[PDB]
Amino acid sequence: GDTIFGKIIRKEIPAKIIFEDDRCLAFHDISPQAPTHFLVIPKKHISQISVAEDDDESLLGHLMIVGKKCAADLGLNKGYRMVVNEGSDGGQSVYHVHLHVLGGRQMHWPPG
Amino acid sequence: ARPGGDTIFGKIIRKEIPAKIIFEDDRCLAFHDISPQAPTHFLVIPKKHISQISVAEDDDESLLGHLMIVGKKCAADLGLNKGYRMVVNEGSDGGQSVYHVHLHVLGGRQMHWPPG
Numbered sequence A: 001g002d003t004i005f006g007k008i009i010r011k012e013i014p015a016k017i018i019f020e021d022d023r024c025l026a027f028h029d030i031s032p033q034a035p036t037h038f039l040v041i042p043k044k045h046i047s048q049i050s051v052a053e054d055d056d057e058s059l060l061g062h063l064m065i066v067g068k069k070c071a072a073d074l075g076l077n078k079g080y081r082m083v084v085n086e087g088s089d090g091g092q093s094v095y096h097v098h099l100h101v102l103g104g105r106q107m108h109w110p111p112g
Numbered sequence B: 001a002r003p004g005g006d007t008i009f010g011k012i013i014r015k016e017i018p019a020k021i022i023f024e025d026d027r028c029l030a031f032h033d034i035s036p037q038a039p040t041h042f043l044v045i046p047k048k049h050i051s052q053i054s055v056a057e058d059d060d061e062s063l064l065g066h067l068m069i070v071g072k073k074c075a076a077d078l079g080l081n082k083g084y085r086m087v088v089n090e091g092s093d094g095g096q097s098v099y100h101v102h103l104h105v106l107g108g109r110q111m112h113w114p115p116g
Ligand SMILES: CNc1nc2c(ncn2[C@@H]2O[C@H](COS(=O)(=O)NC(=O)CCc3c[nH]c4ccccc34)[C@@H](O)[C@H]2O)c2nccn12
Pocket: A107, A108, A109, B008, B017, B019, B031, B032, B033, B034, B035, B036, B089, B094, B095, B096, B097, B098, B099, B102
């Protein structure tokens, strides 16, 4: 909640929401790196994947299932890339765990 | 006779093809990538054959989560203390080369944006 993603979860700032349930939220990224670029985040404040608990595994998996269902609904039928960044080397921009989903163009290698 | 399937990754699961294995349990296998794109670059794969994330079942949630937890634990065990990037590729636009779900973990250098 002490992050901008917490404000988004609490509906305190605008975000174009794609999907919500009781435990996660998917919304378009404000700084998109592909024609389609959205985030899937848990409502629980996990600061970074490195500190996720064992009992968070189903929740983390849920982010990926939601992400792939959202990608399908957004029409990403030629594919996409999912990304989780950790720490400074990973380029983690917000210390609230987030899954990026990017598509609508060819993604290149290496992935940064 | 051949659980895990006959992609290269299925053959690695059954020890038919060599790999450099970091971690193994009943659900997954972590091993170093043969064409690393960072100083440390490994894969985490399920032992259950799922071809790609787009066809994963709802009841694959815990398994997918387990790949990420195993990924982060392996990253810590390998000493990636400045961080890392996890990547799942889907289909042609994602650059998916092998149709058996896999999580990339890359670290030991600054990763750039965009992620490809
Ligand atoms: C461990 N052992 C091992 N690993 C292998 C083998 N063949 C492939 N892999 C590994 O599987 C990963 C699949 O990633 S992925 O499917 O997500 N796709 C890619 O990685 C391709 C990305 C790409 C997109 N455009 C490009 C343009 C040029 C080069 C690559 C690309 C890659 O990182 C490969 O290095 C193999 N044969 C025997 C043992 N082997």
